[PDB]
């Protein structure tokens, strides 16, 4: 189990709830489960030109780490970590 | 490099000392237990103005006046987040140059202090989007007043380039064992433009981003299609990126000044965060390492923000509705 | 000492530039009308704490250190509140000593903030009462030790080996140094290894005449300073005034780009008059002035409200040291 931070933008799929509980042993298994409660949200997270990529303005970290550098969805999750979504904000 | 005397402010420009941190280095000397584990801070504080802006706002203008897009009476026009801005407004003061700055609102009272000392305009920007919205307000002013000079520090390679020749050929001569260069991550140009002529002058280092988390109003866009990614950046560059929040920033600028003397922004505390995590790597692997770091700006204009008193907790609350870097 | 990488901060004291102020100069370049005079600005403020007071906090430090005075742990006790504090705090973090602060109850926040965050206990004291203090702590308290930054030689000394030797390294040509006056180590210091090496160099003080005045009282008494009174060693001395150290202020963010502390302002006002003489005299001039601090830590202190007349009560009423 881990928990995901959602930013304001993708609320409205989490009920408007800013953090949600997840289970999943890859950042792709994680939105697997997002997207099992929460209708919607991955295709959000994801590219829609370049489907298996993630969205060119989404940023996620798992424990703080940049997943774009650890594996992409296929950084390894354990129990206890934290997910971080967040829109691409220059600075931020 | 090497002189003491000059004959302007201006021409005083980097070649800012780099001062290891003993204590806080995982480990200082080999020893038995394995190879030294170093931290290196290059004090960009020691800047006309007081950050590492200084170096692209001076190369920005000095090629657009190159360029001859820059005349005397010229307006410049900036979208920043404060120390571009500050850098800025103290080049144009001493070559005639209006400045209108645009930056966000929830940034901290001393950047609009030292701004108006200046003589710059401040136009303010809605606090969501961060400096995505002030980039977009500025881009429409541009586009509108096509005689206005914007430098823009997002998609400028002057901004790299006084990185490139700069910032990364003083590290190098300073610390030709580096292994590690961690910095923030804003325009980019600091990373992009050091960590390119690092890679190309030192093998296998490895260049690491320290990027601040803000509160979730900062991010709190309309649509994600406001999203923004600075021209400037290549993520071919990095070796890895950290996402550091308020309190752990804080508390690692708190143990700077605490441990080491040295009294910097809140910036540099998410940079010595994800340093201490490189370090520790290093370390667990016993592997030597030599990491150097940015302190980008000193902790004087985020005074007024309370992050450097009371509790750690509450620190956060603080700076929830606020930009740090 | 034309380093570049230190292996501790406490390693990067002192070496600060020295930079040409060509706008604000009364005539950088020599030409017709006669030869140069330029003023040249000693940056302070790029010590390890942003003030000059960095190198007698060492200095006293290591001296008590040299004198058996101070050992492992030892706690330190300071009847200050402002840049020697800061100093003696930092340096005292990073040898390893407790450093104890007395100052008044009505310091504000800011200066008490600050001090905390370099690692410094406050006691406060009733609104030279916090010296009186810290008298008393001295007494009660075992070993506690008082370094006295007024009397102390290592303050004058500290200048004396750094200040002075930097200023003939980089500015052999000095025909005057301005300083601001506090407890005169930076003029004594300075002043006396200048005088020994630059024949009819002019040693000038700008004082400011207006803040709390801590050591304005004792420095009207030839008992206590005596070399402030003897015109072959203080050619001169400016008492300057809160709208002018203003206006000079700022006349020197808008000129030079310098973003200097409050003394400051009386420093510049002293060494333009001096310029102004030699300009009018036909004299060449190389003055050397002292930027002891930057304007950061007056930004919450009113220093730069938009009247000059807000800014003066401002200026009055608050600590430039
Ligand atoms: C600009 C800035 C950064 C980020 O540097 P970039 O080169 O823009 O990526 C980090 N910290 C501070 C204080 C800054 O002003
Ligand atoms: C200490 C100080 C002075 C006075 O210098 P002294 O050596 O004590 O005479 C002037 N300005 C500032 C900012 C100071 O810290």
């Not at chain 2, 802006?53 to 203008?61: C, G, N, Q, S």
Request: with cysteine; net charge negative; proline share 5%.
């Amino acid at each position: 189990n881990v928990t995901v931070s959602i930013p304001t933008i993708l609320r409205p799929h989490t009920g408007g709830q800013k953090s949600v509980s997840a289970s999943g042993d890859t950042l792709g298994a994680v939105i697997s489960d997002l997207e099992a409660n929460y209708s919607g949200i991955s295709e959000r997270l994801m590219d829609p030109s370049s489907p298996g990529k993630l969205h060119r303005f989404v940023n996620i970290y798992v424990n703080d780490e940049d997943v774009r550098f650890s594996g992409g969805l296929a950084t390894a999750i354990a129990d206890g970590d934290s997910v971080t979504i967040l829109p691409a904000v220059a600075g931020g | 490099r090497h002189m003491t005397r000059y004959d302007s402010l201006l021409q005083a420009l980097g070649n800012t000392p780099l001062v290891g941190l003993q204590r806080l280095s995982p480990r200082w000397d080999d020893g038995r237990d394995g190879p030294h584990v170093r931290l290196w801070a290059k004090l960009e504080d020691r800047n006309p103005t007081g950050s590492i802006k200084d170096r692209p706002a001076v190369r920005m203008i000095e090629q657009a006046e190159a360029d001859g897009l820059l005349r005397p009476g010229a307006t410049i026009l900036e979208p920043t987040s404060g120390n571009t801005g500050i850098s800025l407004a103290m080049a144009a003061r001493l070559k005639g140059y209006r400045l209108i700055c645009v930056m966000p609102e929830n940034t901290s009272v001393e950047r609009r202090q030292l701004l108006e000392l200046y003589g710059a305009q401040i136009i303010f920007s809605a606090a969501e989007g961060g400096s995505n919205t002030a980039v977009a307000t500025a881009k429409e002013l541009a586009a509108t007043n096509p005689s206005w000079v914007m430098l823009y520090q997002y998609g400028n390679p002057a901004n790299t380039d006084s990185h490139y020749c700069g910032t990364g050929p003083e590290l190098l001569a300073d610390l030709p064992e580096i292994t590690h260069f961690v910095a923030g991550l804003g325009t980019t140009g600091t990373l992009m433009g050091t960590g390119r002529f690092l890679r190309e002058h030192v093998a296998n280092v490895k260049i690491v981003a320290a990027e601040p988390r803000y509160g979730e109003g900062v991010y709190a866009l309309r649509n994600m299609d406001e999203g923004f990614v600075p021209e400037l950046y290549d993520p071919e560059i990095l070796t890895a990126r950290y996402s550091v929040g308020a309190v752990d920033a804080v508390r690692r600028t708190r143990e700077l000044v605490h441990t080491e003397g040295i009294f910097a922004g809140i910036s540099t505390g998410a940079v010595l965060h994800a340093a201490l995590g490189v370090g520790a790597g290093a370390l667990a692997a016993g592997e030597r390492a030599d990491i150097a770091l940015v302190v980008a700006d000193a902790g004087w204009k985020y005074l007024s923000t309370g992050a450097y008193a009371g509790s750690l907790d509450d620190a956060e609350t603080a700076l929830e509705g606020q930009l740090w870097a």
